[PDB]
Design a protein around this ligand. Structure first.
Ligand SMILES: [Ca+2]
Ligand SMILES: [Ca+2]
Ligand SMILES: [Ca+2]
Length: 536
């Protein structure tokens, strides 16, 4: 197991439009991010996964790129970007850019030429057809959009303004590599690869993710760009299984460092049902099976896990799986303890470290996300009341993760000085904000800070194995072992008292949000009790 700088790293995901606004337009920008690097350094993260800040029409808020080498005017300019890289590096922080190459904006120059001149080479940069099959767009409707100018349908698994790139075109792939090397030379620390498991798509055969040439393309990409460097590459792979992740992350395959797997996220909705048909409560026994599987199947040297609870497309963890009332702070720490002490690279989504929650959206106008808006329009004429629709969106809507970062108790939680913010600031900012989190020595922030420091200083977080222990349904306990070291992690993922039928010899407490001694002696766990102790 060759160790790289990122094996001890914790990554922080920033959603640019909602992090920090510095010019009063109600939207976050690059200078905003740069001004908060001391805060992130204090937190201890070693890298930032920066969501798209490239030139874009914003149909999918940055994931529909019109120019891979230009900063969207709304975030600032290339000078601001360069300074961010510089200032971040000065503080031990690397920047991981969001690589979105499965598709581009329909306003990208390649597509404009493809449509304007169907004989051009860029025409083959996309996927066209005369007779469309029944493939569907992930944002609703057909994945094929009819273009009346050229008289053919172009593929788009996402919005109509996000035409898919043709990865069978070796020349297109090379263009992508040239663009990737453009960013590599600027000093980035890696790439977060957007739906990367779709580049092996074969539309005509209804093959989307995990296509036959997927890994060959990744090997080619690696060899043509990031491979020669020591960067962190993580792919967003919704169709990833432990076996597939081994192929992606085992160093011997020369592909990626790790990938985001969404099997645990699948528990947020009924099996074989739309994400909108959400599950009210976390099936802890189900989560235990999934986490244990990924921990066991990806043994050191054979692969590497990424660890996350939420992102810019998911409900904040406290709202979907934690507690947002009497045990908000405690459940937040519990969930933090539970995830970060497993083997892998953990990712913290902005606001997660202070325990932010979903937002109580009142109506559709207040929303912004095309996915939710498309869902609402369809659902309303298919048996769903507006109230039922708004209820699903308040729980699952991607906009819940996109409300402004809550810095303090001043106007707009200190996010901006503008009359209004692009997305509304959650009123709970009066109680939930960075300033208040930093002031309280035992706040959620310090739990994450401590977890981050434990990983940077102790090899066992990486070297130790993982063993799930038999416990009550809602109790998530496991031990990490290596050499003469044995670590016991116990987390009561429950709003109520649970049993703990174990006997151990505690020799050291690494971290705890409660009186771990009392729990061990009384053989019972208080709601959301969580701790890691070194045992004999
Ligand atoms: Ca701004
Ligand atoms: Ca026509
Ligand atoms: Ca003002």
């Amino acid at each position: 197991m060759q160790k790289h700088w990122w094996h001890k790293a914790t990554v922080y995901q920033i959603y640019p439009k909602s992090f920090m606004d510095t010019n009063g337009d109600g939207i976050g920008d690059l200078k905003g991010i740069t001004s908060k690097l001391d805060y992130l350094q204090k937190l201890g993260v070693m890298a930032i996964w920066l969501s798209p800040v490239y030139d874009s029409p914003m149909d999918d808020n940055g994931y529909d790129i019109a120019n891979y080498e230009a900063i969207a005017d709304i975030f600032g300019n290339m000078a601001d970007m360069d300074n961010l890289l510089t200032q971040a590096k000065m503080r031990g922080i690397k920047i991981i850019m969001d690589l979105v190459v499965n598709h581009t904006s329909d306003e990208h120059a390649w597509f404009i030429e493809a449509r304007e001149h169907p004989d051009s080479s860029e025409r083959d940069y996309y996927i066209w057809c005369d007779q469309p099959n029944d493939l569907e767009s992930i944002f609703g409707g057909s994945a094929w959009q009819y273009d009346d100018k050229s008289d053919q349908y172009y593929l788009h698994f996402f919005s109509k303004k996000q035409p898919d790139l043709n990865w069978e075109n070796a020349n297109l792939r090379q263009k992508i590599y040239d663009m990737m090397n453009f960013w590599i030379d600027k000093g980035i620390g890696g790439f977060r690869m957007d739906v990367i498991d779709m580049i092996g798509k074969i539309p005509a055969q209804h093959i989307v993710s995990n296509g036959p040439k997927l890994h060959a393309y990744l090997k080619e990409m690696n060899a043509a760009s990031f491979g020669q460097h020591d960067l962190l590459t993580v792919g967003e792979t919704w169709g990833a299984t432990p076996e597939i992740a081994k192929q992606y992350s085992n160093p011997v395959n020369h592909e990626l460092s790790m990938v985001f797997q969404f099997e645990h996220i699948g528990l947020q909705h009924k099996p074989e049902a739309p994400k909108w048909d959400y599950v009210k409560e976390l099936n802890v026994p189900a989560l235990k099976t999934i986490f244990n599987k990924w921990q066991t199947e990806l043994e050191l040297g054979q692969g590497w896990n990424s660890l996350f609870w939420n992102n810019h497309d998911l409900p904040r963890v406290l709202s979907i799986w934690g507690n947002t009332g009497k045990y908000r702070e405690k459940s937040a720490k519990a969930l933090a303890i539970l995830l970060h002490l497993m083997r892998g690279t953990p990712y913290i989504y902005q606001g997660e470290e202070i325990g932010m929650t979903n937002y109580p959206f009142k109506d559709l106008n207040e929303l912004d996300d095309i996915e939710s808006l498309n869902y609402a329009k369809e659902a309303f004429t298919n048996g769903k009341s507006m109230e039922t629709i708004m209820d699903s969106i308040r729980m699952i809507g991607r906009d819940n993760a996109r409300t402004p970062m809550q810095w303090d108790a001043s106007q707009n939680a200190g996010f901006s000085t503008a009359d209004k913010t692009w997305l509304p600031v959650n009123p709970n900012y009066k109680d939930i904000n960075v300033q208040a989190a930093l002031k309280n020595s035992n706040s959620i922030f310090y739990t994450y800070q401590q977890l981050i420091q434990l990983r940077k200083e102790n090899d066992w977080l990486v070297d130790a194995d993982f063993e799930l222990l038999p416990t009550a349904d809602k109790v998530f306990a496991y031990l990490r072992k290596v050499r003469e070291e044995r670590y016991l992690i116990v987390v009561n993922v429950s709003d109520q008292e649970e049993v703990l039928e174990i006997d151990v010899d505690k020799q050291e407490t690494l971290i705890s949000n409660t009186n771990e001694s009392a729990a061990l002696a009384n053989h019972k766990l208080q709601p959301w009790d969580a701790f890691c102790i070194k045992i004999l």
